[PDB]
Design an enzyme around this catalytic site. Sequence first.
Site, PDB file in Angstrom:
ATOM      1  N   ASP A 152       2.229   2.594   7.401  1.00  0.00           N
ATOM      2  CA  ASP A 152       1.228   1.866   6.961  1.00  0.00           C
ATOM      3  C   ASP A 152      -0.009   2.104   7.541  1.00  0.00           C
ATOM      4  O   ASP A 152      -0.120   1.123   8.637  1.00  0.00           O
ATOM      5  CB  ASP A 152       1.644   0.460   6.579  1.00  0.00           C
ATOM      6  CG  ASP A 152       0.481  -0.564   5.850  1.00  0.00           C
ATOM      7  OD1 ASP A 152      -0.286   0.193   5.275  1.00  0.00           O
ATOM      8  OD2 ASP A 152       0.916  -1.587   5.639  1.00  0.00           O
ATOM      9  N   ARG A 163      -0.142   9.113   1.204  1.00  0.00           N
ATOM     10  CA  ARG A 163      -0.970   9.175   2.394  1.00  0.00           C
ATOM     11  C   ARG A 163      -0.298   8.142   3.551  1.00  0.00           C
ATOM     12  O   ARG A 163      -0.258   8.292   4.731  1.00  0.00           O
ATOM     13  CB  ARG A 163      -2.194   8.415   2.314  1.00  0.00           C
ATOM     14  CG  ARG A 163      -2.582   7.254   1.719  1.00  0.00           C
ATOM     15  CD  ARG A 163      -3.937   6.733   1.436  1.00  0.00           C
ATOM     16  NE  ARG A 163      -3.862   5.312   0.737  1.00  0.00           N
ATOM     17  CZ  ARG A 163      -3.631   5.180  -0.615  1.00  0.00           C
ATOM     18  NH1 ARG A 163      -3.745   6.389  -1.461  1.00  0.00           N
ATOM     19  NH2 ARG A 163      -3.285   3.991  -1.151  1.00  0.00           N
ATOM     20  N   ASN A 164       0.603   7.286   3.015  1.00  0.00           N
ATOM     21  CA  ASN A 164       1.200   6.291   4.000  1.00  0.00           C
ATOM     22  C   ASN A 164       2.779   6.749   4.463  1.00  0.00           C
ATOM     23  O   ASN A 164       3.403   5.969   5.064  1.00  0.00           O
ATOM     24  CB  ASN A 164       1.259   4.930   3.638  1.00  0.00           C
ATOM     25  CG  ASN A 164      -0.237   4.106   3.917  1.00  0.00           C
ATOM     26  OD1 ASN A 164      -0.608   4.526   5.021  1.00  0.00           O
ATOM     27  ND2 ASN A 164      -0.442   3.234   3.156  1.00  0.00           N
ATOM     28  N   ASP A 170       0.881  -1.124  -0.149  1.00  0.00           N
ATOM     29  CA  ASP A 170      -0.133   0.006  -0.041  1.00  0.00           C
ATOM     30  C   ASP A 170       0.824   1.248  -0.019  1.00  0.00           C
ATOM     31  O   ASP A 170       0.538   2.141   0.865  1.00  0.00           O
ATOM     32  CB  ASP A 170      -1.016   0.034   1.315  1.00  0.00           C
ATOM     33  CG  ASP A 170      -1.962   1.014   1.083  1.00  0.00           C
ATOM     34  OD1 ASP A 170      -2.172   1.480   0.163  1.00  0.00           O
ATOM     35  OD2 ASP A 170      -2.701   1.134   2.147  1.00  0.00           O
TER      36      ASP A 170
HETATM   37  C1  LIG Z   1       5.600   0.026   8.271  1.00  0.00           C
HETATM   38  N1  LIG Z   1       4.525  -0.144   9.273  1.00  0.00           N
HETATM   39  C2  LIG Z   1       3.845   0.774  10.063  1.00  0.00           C
HETATM   40  O1  LIG Z   1       4.628   2.026   9.911  1.00  0.00           O
HETATM   41  C3  LIG Z   1       2.733   0.375  10.678  1.00  0.00           C
HETATM   42  N2  LIG Z   1       2.293   1.356  11.654  1.00  0.00           N
HETATM   43  C4  LIG Z   1       3.160   1.583  12.930  1.00  0.00           C
HETATM   44  N3  LIG Z   1       2.372   2.635  13.445  1.00  0.00           N
HETATM   45  C5  LIG Z   1       3.017   3.254  14.928  1.00  0.00           C
HETATM   46  C6  LIG Z   1       2.313   4.389  15.475  1.00  0.00           C
HETATM   47  C7  LIG Z   1       2.876   4.663  16.687  1.00  0.00           C
HETATM   48  C8  LIG Z   1       3.812   3.964  17.363  1.00  0.00           C
HETATM   49  C9  LIG Z   1       4.719   2.923  16.644  1.00  0.00           C
HETATM   50  C10 LIG Z   1       4.083   2.406  15.476  1.00  0.00           C
HETATM   51  C11 LIG Z   1       1.577   3.559  12.440  1.00  0.00           C
HETATM   52  C12 LIG Z   1       2.457   4.979  12.172  1.00  0.00           C
HETATM   53  C13 LIG Z   1       1.492   5.830  11.535  1.00  0.00           C
HETATM   54  N4  LIG Z   1       0.416   5.970  12.380  1.00  0.00           N
HETATM   55  C14 LIG Z   1      -0.214   7.317  13.004  1.00  0.00           C
HETATM   56  O2  LIG Z   1      -1.365   7.313  13.367  1.00  0.00           O
HETATM   57  C15 LIG Z   1       0.677   8.284  13.200  1.00  0.00           C
HETATM   58  C16 LIG Z   1       0.082   9.735  12.617  1.00  0.00           C
HETATM   59  C17 LIG Z   1       0.739  10.860  12.897  1.00  0.00           C
HETATM   60  C18 LIG Z   1       2.060  10.709  13.323  1.00  0.00           C
HETATM   61  N5  LIG Z   1       3.034  11.698  13.468  1.00  0.00           N
HETATM   62  N6  LIG Z   1       4.277  11.226  13.947  1.00  0.00           N
HETATM   63  C19 LIG Z   1       3.969   9.610  14.177  1.00  0.00           C
HETATM   64  C20 LIG Z   1       2.865   9.669  13.547  1.00  0.00           C
HETATM   65  C21 LIG Z   1       1.880   8.280  13.507  1.00  0.00           C
HETATM   66  C22 LIG Z   1      -0.569   4.874  12.242  1.00  0.00           C
HETATM   67  C23 LIG Z   1       0.303   3.758  13.004  1.00  0.00           C
HETATM   68  C24 LIG Z   1       1.884   2.971  11.270  1.00  0.00           C
HETATM   69  O3  LIG Z   1       1.455   3.094  10.150  1.00  0.00           O
END
Ligand SMILES: CNC(=O)CN1CN(c2ccccc2)C2(CCN(C(=O)c3ccc4n[nH]cc4c3)CC2)C1=O
Length: 291
Positions: free
Chosen positions: A164, A150-151, A146
């Site tokens: 993600d 946006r990601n 994905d």
């Molecule tokens: C590669 N796989 C991933 O990254 C999966 N995962 C792991 N994960 C995560 C979130 C916190 C603590 C540890 C892991 C997220 C990061 C992005 N997300 C947020 O909500 C977000 C939004 C604005 C932010 N500003 N600074 C940081 C931000 C984070 C969704 C969850 C994700 O995509």
Amino acid sequence: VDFPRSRLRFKEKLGEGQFGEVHLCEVDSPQDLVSVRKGHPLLVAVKILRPDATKNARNDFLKEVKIMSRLKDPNIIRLLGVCVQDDPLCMITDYMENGDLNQFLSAHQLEDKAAPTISYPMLLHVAAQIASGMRYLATLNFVHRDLATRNCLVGENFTIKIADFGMSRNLYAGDYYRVQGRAVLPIRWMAWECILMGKFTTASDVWAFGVTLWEVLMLCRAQPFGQLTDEQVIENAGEFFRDQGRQVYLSRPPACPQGLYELMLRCWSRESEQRPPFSQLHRFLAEDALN
Ligand SMILES: CNC(=O)CN1CN(c2ccccc2)C2(CCN(C(=O)c3ccc4n[nH]cc4c3)CC2)C1=O
């Protein structure tokens, strides 16, 4: 070893997941924990599973910890720590103060040389970092599935990390195609073979990177194939398979030179093995950003 949960001080809510939340927190007495800049609030983001979360939610959370635990690259979200020996389960990552890349870029215009903006070289640097992160993922044989702006998250000085979010954010609901009882699908970013056969590979990640590069060069101001319906986008995948010269491609962004557009086109090659590897995509964009 668990991060000391008691050192996490809530500041604000960054995201509403289905079973979890992501919070902005300070870390109390920061330097006591370093394996931070002096006299400044150390902020982190914390993903927290609700104490009343289901068995299924908890299972998915534990698998995400395992997946995140191995991802160690400057342009991929980093796992700073976990709190998982007791409840609620927590993951901790760097706070990326400029939010998702789609919102970030949307708030910028290409600088007019004749005279907030962003330069063409900076756009390339944004794209190169995305390619560097994907290069890393490819070496682990990790398929993202994905990739899109946006990601991606944005920090200071246009630093980018690939994340993600999942497919559930209201803001991006139109980027996903939903059918009852099937996987939710980001069809506008998907290689034809993903749409037709459910086959996600590094080569389809390359195709998605092409679309992501197109987004960056459009400054995130239009959805890919924006004037076509979901059905026509799926039909287009069919035309790639049929290979009778009826398939269509995203057009060249105004900010995108022809040479760079030709590289994009290669990411959308019908044959997977003819799509450029991420090591080459990175090299191209980092040469062009440097020079
Ligand atoms: C590669 N796989 C991933 O990254 C999966 N995962 C792991 N994960 C995560 C979130 C916190 C603590 C540890 C892991 C997220 C990061 C992005 N997300 C947020 O909500 C977000 C939004 C604005 C932010 N500003 N600074 C940081 C931000 C984070 C969704 C969850 C994700 O995509």
